[PDB]
Coordinates of C-alpha atoms and ligand atoms in Angstrom, one line a residue:
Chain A
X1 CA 8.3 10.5 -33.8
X2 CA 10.4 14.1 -33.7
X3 CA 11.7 14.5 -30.2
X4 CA 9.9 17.9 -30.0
X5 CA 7.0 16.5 -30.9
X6 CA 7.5 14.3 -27.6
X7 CA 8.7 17.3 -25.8
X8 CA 5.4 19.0 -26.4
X9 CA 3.2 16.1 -25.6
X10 CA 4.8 15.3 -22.2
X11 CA 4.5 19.1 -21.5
X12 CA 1.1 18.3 -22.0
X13 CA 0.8 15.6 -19.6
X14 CA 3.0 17.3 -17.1
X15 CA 0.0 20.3 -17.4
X16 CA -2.8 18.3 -16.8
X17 CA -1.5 16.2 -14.0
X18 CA -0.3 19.4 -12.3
X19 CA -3.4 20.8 -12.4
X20 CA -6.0 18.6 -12.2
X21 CA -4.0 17.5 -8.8
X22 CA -4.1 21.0 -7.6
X23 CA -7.7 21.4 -8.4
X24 CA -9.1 18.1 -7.1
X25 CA -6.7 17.3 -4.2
X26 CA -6.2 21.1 -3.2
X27 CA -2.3 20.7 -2.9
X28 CA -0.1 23.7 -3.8
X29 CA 0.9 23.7 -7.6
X30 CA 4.5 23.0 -6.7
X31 CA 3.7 19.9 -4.9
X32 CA 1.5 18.9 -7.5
X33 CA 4.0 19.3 -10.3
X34 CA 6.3 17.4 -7.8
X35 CA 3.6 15.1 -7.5
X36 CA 2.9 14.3 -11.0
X37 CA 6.5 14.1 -12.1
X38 CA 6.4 11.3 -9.5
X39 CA 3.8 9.3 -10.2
X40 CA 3.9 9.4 -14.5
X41 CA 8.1 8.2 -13.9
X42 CA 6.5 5.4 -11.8
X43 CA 8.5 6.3 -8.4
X44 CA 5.3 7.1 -6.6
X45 CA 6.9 7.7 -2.8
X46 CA 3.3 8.2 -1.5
X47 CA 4.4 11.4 0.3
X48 CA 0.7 12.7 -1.8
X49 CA -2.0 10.7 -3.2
X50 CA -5.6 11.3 -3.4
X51 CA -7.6 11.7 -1.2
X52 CA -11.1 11.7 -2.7
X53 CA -13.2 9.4 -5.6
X54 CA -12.7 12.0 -7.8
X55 CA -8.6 12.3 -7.0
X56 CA -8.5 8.5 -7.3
X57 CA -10.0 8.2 -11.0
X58 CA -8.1 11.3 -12.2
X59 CA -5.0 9.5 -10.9
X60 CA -5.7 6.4 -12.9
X61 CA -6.1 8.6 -16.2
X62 CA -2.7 10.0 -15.2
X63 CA -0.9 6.8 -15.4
X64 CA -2.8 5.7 -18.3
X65 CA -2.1 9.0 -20.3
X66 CA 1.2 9.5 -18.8
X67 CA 3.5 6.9 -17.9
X68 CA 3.9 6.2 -22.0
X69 CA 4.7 9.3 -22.6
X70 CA 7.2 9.7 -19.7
X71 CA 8.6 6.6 -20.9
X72 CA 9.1 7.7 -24.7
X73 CA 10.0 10.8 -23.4
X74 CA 13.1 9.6 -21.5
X75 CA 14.6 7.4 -23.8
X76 CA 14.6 10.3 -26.3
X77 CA 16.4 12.3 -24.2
X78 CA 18.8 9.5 -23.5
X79 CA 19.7 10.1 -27.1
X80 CA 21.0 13.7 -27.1
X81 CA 22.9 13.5 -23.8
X82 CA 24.7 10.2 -25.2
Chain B
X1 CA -0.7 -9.3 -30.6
X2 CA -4.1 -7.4 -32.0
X3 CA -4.5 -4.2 -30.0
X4 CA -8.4 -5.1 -29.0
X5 CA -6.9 -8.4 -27.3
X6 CA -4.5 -6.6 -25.5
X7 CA -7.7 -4.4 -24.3
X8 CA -9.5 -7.4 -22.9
X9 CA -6.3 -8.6 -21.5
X10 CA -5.4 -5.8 -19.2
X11 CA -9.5 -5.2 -18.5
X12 CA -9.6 -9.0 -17.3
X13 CA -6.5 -7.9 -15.0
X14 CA -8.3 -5.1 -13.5
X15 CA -11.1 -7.1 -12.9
X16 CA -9.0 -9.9 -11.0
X17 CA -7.4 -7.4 -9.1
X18 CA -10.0 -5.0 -7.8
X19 CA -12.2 -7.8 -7.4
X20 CA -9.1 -9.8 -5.2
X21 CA -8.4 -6.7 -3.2
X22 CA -11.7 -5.6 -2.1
X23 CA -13.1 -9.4 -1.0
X24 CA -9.3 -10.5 0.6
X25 CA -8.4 -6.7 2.4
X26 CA -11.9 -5.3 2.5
X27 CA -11.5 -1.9 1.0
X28 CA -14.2 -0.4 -1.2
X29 CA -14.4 -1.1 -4.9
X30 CA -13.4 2.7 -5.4
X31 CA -10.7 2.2 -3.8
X32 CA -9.6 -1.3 -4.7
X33 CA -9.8 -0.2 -8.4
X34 CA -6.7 2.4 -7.8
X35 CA -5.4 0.1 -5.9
X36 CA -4.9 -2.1 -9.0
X37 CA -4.1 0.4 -11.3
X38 CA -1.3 2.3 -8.9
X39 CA -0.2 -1.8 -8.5
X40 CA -0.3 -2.8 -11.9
X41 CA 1.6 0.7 -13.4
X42 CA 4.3 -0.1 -10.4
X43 CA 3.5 3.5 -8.8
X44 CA 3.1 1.7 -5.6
X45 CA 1.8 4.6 -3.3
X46 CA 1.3 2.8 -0.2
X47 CA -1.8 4.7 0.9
X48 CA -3.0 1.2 0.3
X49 CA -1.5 -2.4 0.3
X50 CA -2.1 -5.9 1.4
X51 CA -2.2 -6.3 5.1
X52 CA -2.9 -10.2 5.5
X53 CA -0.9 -13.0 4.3
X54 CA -2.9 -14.2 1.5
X55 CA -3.6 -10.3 0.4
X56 CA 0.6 -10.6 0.2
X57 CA -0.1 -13.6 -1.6
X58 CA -2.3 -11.8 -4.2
X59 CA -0.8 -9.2 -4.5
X60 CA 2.2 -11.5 -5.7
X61 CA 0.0 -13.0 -8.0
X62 CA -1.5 -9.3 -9.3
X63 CA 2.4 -8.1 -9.8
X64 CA 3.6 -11.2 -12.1
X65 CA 0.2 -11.4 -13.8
X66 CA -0.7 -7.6 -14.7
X67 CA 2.3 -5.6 -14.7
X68 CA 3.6 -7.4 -17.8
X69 CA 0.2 -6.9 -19.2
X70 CA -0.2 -3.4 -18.4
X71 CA 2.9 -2.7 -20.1
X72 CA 1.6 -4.2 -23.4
X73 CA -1.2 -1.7 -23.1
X74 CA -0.6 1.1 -22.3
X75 CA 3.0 1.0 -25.7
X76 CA -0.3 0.2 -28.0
X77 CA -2.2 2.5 -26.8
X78 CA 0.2 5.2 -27.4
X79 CA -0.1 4.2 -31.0
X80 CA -3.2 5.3 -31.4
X81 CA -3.2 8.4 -29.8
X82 CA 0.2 9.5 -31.2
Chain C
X1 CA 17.8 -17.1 -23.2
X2 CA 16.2 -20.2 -22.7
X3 CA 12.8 -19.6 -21.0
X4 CA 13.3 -22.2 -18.3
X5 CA 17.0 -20.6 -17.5
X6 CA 15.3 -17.2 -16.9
X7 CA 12.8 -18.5 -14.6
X8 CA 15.7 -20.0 -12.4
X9 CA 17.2 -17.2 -12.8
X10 CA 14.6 -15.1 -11.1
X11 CA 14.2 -17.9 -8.9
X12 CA 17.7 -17.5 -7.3
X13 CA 17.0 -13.8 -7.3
X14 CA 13.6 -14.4 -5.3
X15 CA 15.5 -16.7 -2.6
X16 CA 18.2 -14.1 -2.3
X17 CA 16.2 -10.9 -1.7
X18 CA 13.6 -13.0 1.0
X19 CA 16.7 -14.9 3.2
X20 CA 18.5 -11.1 3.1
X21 CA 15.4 -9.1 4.3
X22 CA 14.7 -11.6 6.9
X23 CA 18.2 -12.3 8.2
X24 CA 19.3 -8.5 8.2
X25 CA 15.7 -6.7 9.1
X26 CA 14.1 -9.3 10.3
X27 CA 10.5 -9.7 9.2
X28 CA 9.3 -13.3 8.6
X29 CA 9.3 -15.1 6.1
X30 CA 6.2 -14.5 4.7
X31 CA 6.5 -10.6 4.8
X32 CA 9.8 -11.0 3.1
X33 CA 9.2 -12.7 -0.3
X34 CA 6.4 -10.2 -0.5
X35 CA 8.6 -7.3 0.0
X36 CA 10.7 -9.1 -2.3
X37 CA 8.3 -8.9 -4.8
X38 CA 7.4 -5.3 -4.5
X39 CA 10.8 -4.5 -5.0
X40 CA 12.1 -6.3 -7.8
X41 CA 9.1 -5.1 -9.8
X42 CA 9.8 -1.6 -9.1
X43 CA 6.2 -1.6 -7.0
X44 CA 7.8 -0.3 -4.1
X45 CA 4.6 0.2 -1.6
X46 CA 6.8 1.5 1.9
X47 CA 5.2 -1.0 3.8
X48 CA 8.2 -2.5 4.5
X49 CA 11.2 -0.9 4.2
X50 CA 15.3 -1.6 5.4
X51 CA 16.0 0.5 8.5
X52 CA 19.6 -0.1 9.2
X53 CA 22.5 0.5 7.0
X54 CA 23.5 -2.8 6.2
X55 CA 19.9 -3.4 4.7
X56 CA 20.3 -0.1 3.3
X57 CA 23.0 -1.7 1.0
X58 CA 21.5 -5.2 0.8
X59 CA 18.3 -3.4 -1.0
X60 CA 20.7 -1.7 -3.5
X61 CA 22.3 -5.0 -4.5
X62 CA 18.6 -6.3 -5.0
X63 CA 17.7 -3.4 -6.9
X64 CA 20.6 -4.0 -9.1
X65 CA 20.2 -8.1 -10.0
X66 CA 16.4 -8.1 -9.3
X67 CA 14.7 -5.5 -11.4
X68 CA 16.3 -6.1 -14.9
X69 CA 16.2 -10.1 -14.2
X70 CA 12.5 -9.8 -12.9
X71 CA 11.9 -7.5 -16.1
X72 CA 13.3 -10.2 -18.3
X73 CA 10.9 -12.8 -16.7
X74 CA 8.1 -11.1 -16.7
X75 CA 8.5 -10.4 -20.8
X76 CA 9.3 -14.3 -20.9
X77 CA 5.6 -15.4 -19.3
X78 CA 3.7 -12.9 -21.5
X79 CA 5.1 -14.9 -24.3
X80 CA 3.1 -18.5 -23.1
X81 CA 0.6 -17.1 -21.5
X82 CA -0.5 -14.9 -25.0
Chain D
X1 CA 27.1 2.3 -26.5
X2 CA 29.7 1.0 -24.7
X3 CA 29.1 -1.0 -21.7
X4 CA 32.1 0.7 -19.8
X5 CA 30.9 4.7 -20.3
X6 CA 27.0 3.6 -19.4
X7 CA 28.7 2.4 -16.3
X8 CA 30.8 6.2 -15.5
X9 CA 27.1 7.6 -16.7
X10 CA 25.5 5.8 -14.3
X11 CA 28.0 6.2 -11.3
X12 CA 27.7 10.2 -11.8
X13 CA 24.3 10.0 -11.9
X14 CA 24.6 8.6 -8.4
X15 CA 26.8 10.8 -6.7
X16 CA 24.5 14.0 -8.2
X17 CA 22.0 12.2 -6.6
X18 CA 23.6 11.2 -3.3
X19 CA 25.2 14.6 -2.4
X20 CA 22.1 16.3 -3.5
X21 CA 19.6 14.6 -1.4
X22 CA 22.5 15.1 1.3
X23 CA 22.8 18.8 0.8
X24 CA 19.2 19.8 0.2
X25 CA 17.7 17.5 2.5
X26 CA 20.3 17.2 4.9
X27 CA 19.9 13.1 4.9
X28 CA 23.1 10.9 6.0
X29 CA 25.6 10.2 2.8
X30 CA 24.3 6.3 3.4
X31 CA 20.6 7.4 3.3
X32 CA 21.4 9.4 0.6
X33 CA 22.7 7.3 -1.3
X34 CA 20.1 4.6 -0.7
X35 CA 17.4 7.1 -1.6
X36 CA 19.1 8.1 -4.5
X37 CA 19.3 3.8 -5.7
X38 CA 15.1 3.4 -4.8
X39 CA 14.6 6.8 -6.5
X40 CA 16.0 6.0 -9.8
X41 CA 15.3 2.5 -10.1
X42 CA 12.0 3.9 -9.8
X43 CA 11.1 1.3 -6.6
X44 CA 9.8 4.5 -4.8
X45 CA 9.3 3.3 -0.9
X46 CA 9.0 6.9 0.5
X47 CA 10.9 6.0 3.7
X48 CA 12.8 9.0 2.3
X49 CA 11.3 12.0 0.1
X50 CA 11.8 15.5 0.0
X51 CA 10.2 18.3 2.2
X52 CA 11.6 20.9 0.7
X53 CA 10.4 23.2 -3.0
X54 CA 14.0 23.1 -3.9
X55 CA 14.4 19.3 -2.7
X56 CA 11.0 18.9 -5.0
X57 CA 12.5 20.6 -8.3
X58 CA 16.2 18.7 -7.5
X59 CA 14.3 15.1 -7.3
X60 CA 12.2 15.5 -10.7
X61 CA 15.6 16.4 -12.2
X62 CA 17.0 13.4 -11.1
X63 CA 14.2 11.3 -12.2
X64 CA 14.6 12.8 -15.4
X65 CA 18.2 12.3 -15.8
X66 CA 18.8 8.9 -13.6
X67 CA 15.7 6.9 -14.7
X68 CA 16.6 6.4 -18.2
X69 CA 20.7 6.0 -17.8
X70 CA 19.9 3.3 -14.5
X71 CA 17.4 1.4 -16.9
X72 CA 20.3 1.6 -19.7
X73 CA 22.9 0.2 -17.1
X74 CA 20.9 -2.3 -15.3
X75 CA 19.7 -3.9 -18.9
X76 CA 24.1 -3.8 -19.5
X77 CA 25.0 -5.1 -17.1
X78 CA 22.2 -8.7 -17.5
X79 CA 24.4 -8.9 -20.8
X80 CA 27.7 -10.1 -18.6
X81 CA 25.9 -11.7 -16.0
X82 CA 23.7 -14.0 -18.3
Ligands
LIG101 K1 11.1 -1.3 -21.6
LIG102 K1 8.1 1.7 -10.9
LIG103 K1 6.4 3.4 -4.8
LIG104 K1 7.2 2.6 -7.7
LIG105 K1 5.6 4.3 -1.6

């Protein structure tokens, strides 16, 4: 797959983590950006989570939808630094 | 491995999981689902986690048997979306 | 790699990281494989944590030799268990 | 690539994580350090996160450009142990 093409579709990941977080857990969008950058790389410090049903299965859609992608995402990158 | 296998796979995962969580630490099936899936992806929050000796146990169990799994899943599902 | 060889492997890595967290922050035994666990497979809940420097640096040296040999393992049981 | 220049790629990858964390966060150079290992290796405890915006934007930079270069190194370096 182009690596623009997985530019673009982590950018879209990284957009509807941030703000479905800030929408359904009412955190600032810089914390949620913060928040989804952490959670689709897998680090997941717990410093936010949801709070609510509603938080909880958006959350699981995230990792579904996003942790691929992240993943793919990286290892491209790994490419055109080395 | 067919992609529809891996499917059952990680859903019989889930299943053991949540259904391990909520009966050995008492937490909600809501809740034990994320639980699972923040477990499974390796997110590891911490807003939940085992807090008796055989939910330790389990959850030892749920690591070896579903992260490996959930792996699987979640490359062949990026197939079919991208 | 020879199956069986990996699963010592991991093995030795699982006795390391529990003897280490219980000698140096001393949680039992118990608490220690599991946190063992969490952390060689990148689950990382907080639960239990190192608070002293010396554990500080024990946990890097885990993170090192545990996460790429439990990675390896994990791969391995996949294999006979699909 | 060569094992040797994954290892230098790793170790800066380190110090811009150690004396970042330091600097933004004002955390010990061993805390650091440590936070910086759990960070990228993508174990995640949360003992240690950022409270800062500019501690927020520093980490998912790091996660972006230590996640894939400490999974790179750590896969290396099982090559000369096993
Ligand atoms: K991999
Ligand atoms: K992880
Ligand atoms: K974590
Ligand atoms: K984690
Ligand atoms: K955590």
């Amino acid at each position: 797959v182009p690596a623009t093409r997985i530019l673009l579709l982590v950018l879209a990941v990284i957009i509807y983590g941030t703000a479905g977080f800030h929408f359904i857990e009412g955190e600032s969008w810089t914390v949620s950006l913060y928040w989804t950058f952490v959670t689709i790389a897998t680090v997941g410090y717990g410093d936010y989570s949801p709070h609510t049903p509603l938080g909880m299965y958006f959350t699981c859609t995230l990792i579904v939808l996003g942790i691929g992608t992240f993943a793919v995402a990286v290892e491209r990158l790994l490419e055109f630094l080395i």
